[PDB]
Amino acid sequence: ITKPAIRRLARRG
């Protein structure tokens, strides 16, 4: 997984 996908994963929980 990659930085953008990480930063959104942080927001879906």
Added chain:
Amino acid sequence: SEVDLEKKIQEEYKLWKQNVPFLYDLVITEALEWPSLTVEWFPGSERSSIQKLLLGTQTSGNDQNYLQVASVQLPYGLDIVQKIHHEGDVNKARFMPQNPDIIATLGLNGNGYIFDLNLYREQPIVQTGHQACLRHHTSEGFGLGWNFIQEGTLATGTEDTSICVWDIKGKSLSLEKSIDVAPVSVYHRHTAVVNDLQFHLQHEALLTSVSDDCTLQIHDTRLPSSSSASQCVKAHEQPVNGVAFNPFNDYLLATASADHTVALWDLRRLNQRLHTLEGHEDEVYNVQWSPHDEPILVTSSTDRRVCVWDLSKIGEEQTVEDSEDGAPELMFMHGGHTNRVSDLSWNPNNKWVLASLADDNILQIWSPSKVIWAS
């Protein structure tokens, strides 16, 4: 329903572990014997440092309660190193900002308590208990706060709906006896439980409170109870669970509420709310400002989530795919808890480290990956 509910609850829980190594730089998990409704990092660290946490017990009458000091292994475990005896559940516990040795608690039946840790530095278990008992309340509460400018002054707020203001400065404490203490002030300005109160960081007399009566009020503790609140505004349409002053911005403050949202407020215009943080799907019990970065704050809720909010990112726009996911200001959602969340605490020693408590006995010390917060 409940059975259907639990299965959902975990299954996404261990989906969360699966996700942890990408999301967190740190995750420490502890199961406690009893729950804790209160947590607060002590300032200072020893040497990979080890740091200290204030904690409590919620025996519910079943066994003896403890005010607890725990030490954590920080860059990975953590252990309880002191237990002081406590009358009733430790509803909330806070150290004196001038002297973290001094602890205030809200105990059984609305009693305030003062502990001096300097009295028993070496002892694993202190049976002696408290050094002082703050008299006045008649029901149990969670509103407790200490005064940052005036050493030894603190405020309490309770289900009895009163607010008491105490001054323990100069009062000797000893292992001999527990002194009784009478409030310096008693304010009846709420029609329901005082949920949270807090003294302003840079003003001696300013004391804010919120209640189940949906009000945000501002009291000047210089004036006698004969006077009214200096400000009282409706803050939400449902109970207000928490209030936090921004540690960098004197006029900026926040309220957490059972409406599922957090409101932000300018102090000199409490009549029109600045902004609303949506994104929780149940009551928002608690709200805390980062002691490191002014646009950063944290909210926990009955939806078992903890949200980190960056306020820089307001008035910012983005793709619809992200609009699906929340506001531009929602930075991080901790999913580490498998039940409603009791209390939170920003670590003041280490940037971007948080402690959180759930009602099913879990303590968690976590930190969101550096990816997500540094830019």
